UniProtKB/Swiss-Prot annotation, chain B:
Membership in a protein family: Belongs to the caliciviridae capsid protein family.
CDD domains: rhv_like
Pfam families linked to this entry: Calici_coat, Calici_coat_C
Residue ranges, annotated region (Protruding domain): 211-516
Classification of source organism: Viruses, Riboviria, Orthornavirae, Pisuviricota, Pisoniviricetes
Record's comment describing the protein's domains: The shell domain (S domain) contains elements essential for the formation of the icosahedron. The Protruding domain (P domain) is divided into sub-domains P1 and P2. P domain interacts in dimeric contacts that increase the stability of the capsid and form the protrusions on the virion. An hypervariable region in P2 is thought to play an important role in receptor binding and immune reactivity.
Region called Shell domain, residue ranges: 1-210
Region (Interaction with host receptor CD300LF) location: 284-352
Transmembrane segments: none
Function: Capsid protein self assembles to form an icosahedral capsid with a T=3 symmetry, about 38 nm in diameter, and consisting of 180 capsid proteins. A smaller form of capsid with a diameter of 23 nm might be capsid proteins assembled as icosahedron with T=1 symmetry. The capsid encapsulates the genomic RNA and is decorated with VP2 proteins. Mediates virion attachment to the host cell receptor CD300LF.
Protein name: Capsid protein VP1
Organism the protein comes from: Norovirus (isolate Mouse/NoV/United States/MNV1/2002/GV) (MNV-1)
Region of interest (P2 sub-domain), residue spans: 264-402
Residue numbers spanned by region P1 sub-domain 2: 403-516
Keywords: Host cytoplasm, Virion
Length: 504, 516, 504
């Protein structure tokens, strides 16, 4: 079992002379195995020998009585002790090798002859009892610090020889394994410190608000139902409602919910003998800060849907009696083969259809949208006709996963179309202003969300939140399925991006 | 010993990290009475009320299999002694019999969750942080494990109030089979339990009748003799059928297990599919006699619009039905007489048919004026013309609060219908159509007048044909007053009507039944 | 010092037999006094003998290495040990009495003869060293539970005999005292438990977003600067942006930022020979749920400012060619002595000025505001002319405190007024949807917020957040002072509502 060629490794006896205190641990933790939820795997007869089933590093993050207990202390030092349970019956065969890679090693792919040159154990897939093995602490600094993800001895588990079993017509016999881990005898924490809450060990908890009240992210109107639709484009590149879980703001996403689909600018009204009173807005961020052409395709809040929309603008008219007045304008977003709408440069041309020379006055303006016309869920012309640095399309989903929608409805002028087709975003704004206001640290690749009804308590599905800012949902239907809009999202854990959900 | 040992025989109580806990030695000086429980209960294990569970390959990881809380409701004895005494203490020992076929895999974890822990999710990440035990679903022997009593007051009361050390397990890594043909072995479990060294009750009170641990008693009468709850007619055969709509919302014969009525279920067997009303007879030169019935409860009490969508016992189907009425007409020489009226349910393009508001209508094709004086009367049906087993217009066409549809079923579970036939007046064919309830009227009048206490989610039933003495099927009974049965065929399947539904044990929703 | 008539009190030796585990504590906590920040006070020559200077209960909340350490355990049991430091020099005089009130006692006022009938110490205001005294645990249940604020032995400190000192012209010599408290020898925690984060010990942390980006709460437009104004009404009763710190939603506040100032309804358009096309909206909550006259003065999101405003409505016109179209309407909010605007009942009458009988069609509508006219920061007519259950006015501020504003600007039609006067709210919506999405537990009366610049780091002021949902700021100026709008709010601690800030 635990017979690997490694000398014993000292901790909390090598970093005591140079650490103020040496704090201890509630001794009922040294007697209880706990699982780090990225320590699960499932071999299957169709897995080529060489895959990496679990690869996890030593730390206080492997044991949620330590990921939490490490908010009061400055540094940790010492060993751990792990064990692996393989759930196979006596009609299977095929080995599995666990290797203790040292803490300075070019990460990447280890072919099945490079995982065994390490110190390692080999164990079959017919072992009842757990395969205990130690996780020593090979370091070079005396004691690590808790707010600093620095390198430490890692475990890597590789499928050494493929699984060979029978299997019924359902569902093909995965051999599932799990890993558990408890502090060794001399894992001590170092310096006591007032407990700061935003330490980097925090499951990303989502706001407890029903998706029926949250403010939408692409059109200023509340959410009116969430659904899945495998028929619609499965890889859109909307430019709003785009926030990574770790805080960053992809695209043109604004931190408010009121900046959406509306821009501020310096207006330039002038009369023409044709359409009448045209306007050439020089853009600006709504809060007032000047605008410069940067990496995002437009000022924060510009729309990301092609089609004609009217804007509502206050115009300090210099007529007699009609001093201040809110009037509607007319702006075209799509390419349309003739339009100098260059937001990337900071120039948007919006006109009207008026015959009089009504003498407006220039000045600061913020233009709220009034109604779309000929809506098209595709990119407007952010440049004249050139390219522009924009956010990459949402994705990529595993085979058998579809994007989750958050559908709102919008005003729409038409003549014969009566059904109010309208837009949808990836996350409601109450999630954007929540992931950018916490700066959660991101553990691996995707959270295992769960949409529970608030009163009945029964689940509805298990959506997987990809930290690149979207929510994939396992699905196989043909038509758009609609879900209730009065539940609550709640997290469960992190999970490897190769995770397979429960079909709905 | 068995043959052989390609299984894994965990016979040892695994070491749980939790100190011993004092039982009835902290309640001896504060319960002014000596008490002991028969020393032959401490000797043999015995199945709990909630005893059974199933680990089917469809159960994902994280589905709580059996979440049973320490208390007197964990033996058939300790739950039948605990109707005399008022309060308990002390530990307990629970077995766990899961001995799946030698061609299975997958592991479960049992975690002694302490008191005062928020019930609810308990996901698979925080089931190992408690003092737990991991055991394989192939284990041969029974796996003993303790259930201590962590508390802050001396002795709990024997009303469900208190909070005690639950013992919840969780399908840790899923059950997957290995045999080379078209079958996955659902491993069935059992749960035996006995009071520990110093379990004990405290104060001796009268064995009240409507106590809290009455298991359940279903009435021992054949479905052949019971009465239907949607038409005044006997039951003529029970059956399962996937062809018919498997999620109806019948507003009759709909009672919870603990007696709470739902919708418009009467308590009589005669109040069914009928109504009392203040009549208003008039005549006009078209069809003839017209009766504007103002609804009223069948017993005489006045009707009021409430949450239920009609007066108690109003018919909840759609179609034309005839009606018998005892009327006292003014015509000399023939004063008292029973006559037949006609009433059409559902949309009619002339519909002030508001059984919810309290007004319905009837029309008799009378030539002259049937001089009938208005008067309170009940109206029992006699025949249906255009039968449609759907909700009629309880308002004119508007929305009305009513009972939720019968559900939800597991994948592969069909509603078990108690079926009767009603008199039919039609013209073409001669096959009297069929209506069907979920529980015969005796079951409703029984649950409504007993008020049991439902334990977890469902009662696993059976069906013992008393003539020969063999079982017929293993049907599960949800708490919402419907009997789901596992079934896979396409055409209907009818059962004999001599069986005696007998409760077997409590059971969660996820219990995968035995297919038929 | 610590010579009071109380028997010793057992803990963790009386609740061990009936507690699964008995967990211990990092033994470097038993050797370090810590302060519970509601344990500060300042006697002053103008304090009548009898005031209660500090009144604090035993618990794990008195020692932030326990308020945090009590998220992993189920129950605590045992003693504590407190000490009080009085900072007076040898020219003062006047006693102070500390009393150990037992844990079942009608709270209220204790006159200075009822605070000494308890067990108590008396100590002068000329004592150098700390006045140590024990905080035993008089209970009746074996061990308390950590998620349950139950009663326990309290300390009460009363000014027994007034202070008598000289004092210069500035600033009148307050004798300040502080309290510190550490676990006794046998304060043990009971049952280990996965650490749930939302335990009831959590300083209410405010979103880290500059007030220049947050969405306003009374008019759908971003915040354009925050200021103090002692001249404006100092006790307004706005009906939006009103959320208690402990989660509840006072008034008509909506949980979105898009529901603001806009209502949804079932429209009833009909033509008249006068104004033309009038409309009688029967209100509804925007998400779709039906509306019933309740305790709040209007459906969630209705405006709370008197004056005429136009609304923008999509109207499925049954003409030929013009099927769908967004048109402007006209609605009056103020009393105006003739208006059947009864939101409380669910009926709002909005008209237009059109001569044609344009044949609209009824249906669901949501009415976004377009422009105000004759704005008045006073209540509209929520009933016909009667009263209505509404939120109480903001307050009450201590003498020398003024309400903080969050000023936004709004569209406005006029003829001669050019300066765009506009509305302000008490908290931006990113705070409302943040205090209602956490349900923080509230400790005493007010948080000590602090508005720090994000880069320079230097403070700007110390605003005090009253949990009734507002932010008071100590001020003495005459005119409206304006603050920078690019800082960050950050909490410091709880604080007694009698706290005196730093004047700005």
């Amino acid at each position: 079992e635990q017979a690997v060629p490694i000398q014993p490794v000292a901790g909390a006896a090598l970093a005591a002379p140079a650490a103020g205190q040496i704090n201890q641990i509630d001794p009922w933790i040294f007697q209880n195995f706990v699982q780090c939820p990225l320590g699960e795997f499932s071999i299957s007869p169709r897995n080529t020998p060489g895959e990496i089933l679990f690869d996890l590093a030593l730390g206080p993050g492997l044991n949620p009585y330590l990921a939490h207990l490490s908010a009061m202390y400055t540094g940790w030092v010492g060993n751990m002790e792990v064990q692996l349970v393989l759930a196979g019956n006596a009609f299977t065969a095929g080995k599995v090798v666990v290797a203790l890679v040292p803490p300075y090693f070019p990460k990447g792919s280890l072919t099945t002859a490079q995982i065994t040159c390490f110190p390692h154990v080999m164990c079959d897939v017919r072992t009842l009892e757990p395969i205990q093995l130690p996780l020593l602490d090979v370091r070079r600094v005396l004691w690590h610090a808790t707010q600093d993800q620095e390198e430490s001895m890692r475990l890597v588990c590789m499928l050494y020889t493929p699984l060979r079993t029978n299997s019924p017509g359902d569902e093909s016999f995965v051999v599932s394994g799990r890993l558990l881990s408890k502090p060794a005898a001399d894992f001590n924490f170092v310096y006591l410190t007032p407990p700061i809450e935003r330490t980097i060990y925090r499951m990303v908890d989502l706001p407890v608000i029903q998706p029926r009240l949250c403010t939408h992210a692409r059109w200023p109107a509340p959410v009116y139902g969430l659904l899945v639709d495998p028929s619609l484009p499965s890889n859109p590149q909307w430019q709003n409602g785009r926030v990574h879980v770790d805080g960053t703001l992809l695209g043109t996403t604004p931190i408010s919910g009121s900046w959406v689909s509306c821009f501020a600018a310096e207006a330039a009204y002038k009369f023409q003998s044709g359409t009448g009173e045209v306007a050439t807005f020089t853009l600006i961020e709504q809060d007032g800060s000047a605008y410069v052409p940067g990496d995002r395709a437009a000022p924060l809040g510009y729309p990301d849907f092609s089609g004609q929309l009217e804007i509502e603008v206050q115009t300090e008219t210099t007529k007699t009696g009609d001093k201040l007045k809110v009037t509607t304008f007319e702006m075209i977003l799509g390419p349309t083969t003739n339009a100098d709408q260059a937001p990337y440069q900071g120039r948007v041309f919006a006109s009207v259809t008026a015959a009089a020379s009504l003498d407006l006055v220039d000045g600061r303006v913020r233009a709220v949208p009034r109604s779309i016309y000929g809506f098209q869920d595709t990119i407007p012309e952010y440049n004249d006709g050139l390219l522009v640095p924009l956010a990459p399309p949402i994705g990529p989903f595993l085979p058998g996963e579809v994007l989750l929608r958050f559908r709102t409805y919008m005003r729409q002028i038409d003549t014969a179309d009566a059904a109010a087709e309208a837009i949808d975003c990836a996350l409601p704004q109450e999630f954007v202003s929540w992931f950018a206001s916490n700066a959660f640290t991101v553990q691996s690749e995707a959270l295992l969300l769960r949409y529970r009804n608030t009163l009945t308590g029964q689940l509805l599905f298990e959506c997987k939140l990809y930290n690149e800012g979207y929510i994939a949902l396992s699905y196989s239907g043909s038509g758009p399925l609609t879900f209730p809009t009065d539940g609550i999202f709640e997290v469960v854990s992190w999970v490897p991006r190769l995770y397979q959900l429960a079909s709905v």
